[PDB]
Amino acid sequence: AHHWGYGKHNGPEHWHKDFPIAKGERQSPVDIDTHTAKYDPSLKPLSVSYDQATSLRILNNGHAFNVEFDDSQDKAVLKGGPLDGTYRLIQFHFHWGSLDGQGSEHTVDKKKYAAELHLTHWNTKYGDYGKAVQQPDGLAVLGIFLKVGSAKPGLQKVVDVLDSIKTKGKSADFTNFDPRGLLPESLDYWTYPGSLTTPPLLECVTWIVLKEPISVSSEQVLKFRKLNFNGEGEPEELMVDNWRPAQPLKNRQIKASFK
């Protein structure tokens, strides 16, 4: 069974042994070289339609925590931008560091942010998520950088429930959470074709990475770092540095929605 992680013996540099696509042609994350990314006037504004989002549950899955949504019909969806069709929000999660100077998966001119939020959506033309991940245009992940400064008010409900899901396999009710409270002001973005950043590392993602980071407080991110990778009663391994480093860009272009 799966025994990959972010530890000293099963981290990203080992993943290729069980998931050979780890060395593939469209792996994520990547460094976004802002001077090489080209403005594409053909890109549209993103349409983030989360007014009818139905959050359900929050789960510590042993590598991050997922806030899960009802994706049994079109409620919270992502459209426009580089996308054709409609992508349904299934979950969001974060990647973060042991200290503020690392944690993001994507980097910007080699800068690492303290954390990165991933809002994961699947293309409804494929009927279910499991079918969508088998397709090159199956998923759209909206990535948002976190820097440490002022608190993010809309994040606080998330951080206050974390004490109740400290260890792997724990979950809690998490209804009526509004993910619009996690967005920055601007929806300017970069986009490129990539992959899932944890196993199975499938090359099924259109990445949309917002240029504007959100600000969270030191106290908020410190609470992320109190989570555990381990299960209940097991030796404590703090859930920190659950990020994959930048992968080779290979034959890919990163496009900018903005001049």
Ligand SMILES: NS(=O)(=O)c1nc2ccccc2s1
């Ligand atoms: N999936 S993996 O990163 O290749 C992996 N690494 C390790 C290390 C020790 C025991 C089992 C596994 S499975």
Ligand SMILES: NS(=O)(=O)c1nc2ccccc2s1
């Ligand atoms: N970190 S991510 O690319 O957004 C992502 N990776 C995976 C892997 C397995 C299942 C869901 C997701 S969502």
Ligand SMILES: [Zn+2]
């Ligand atoms: Zn992620």
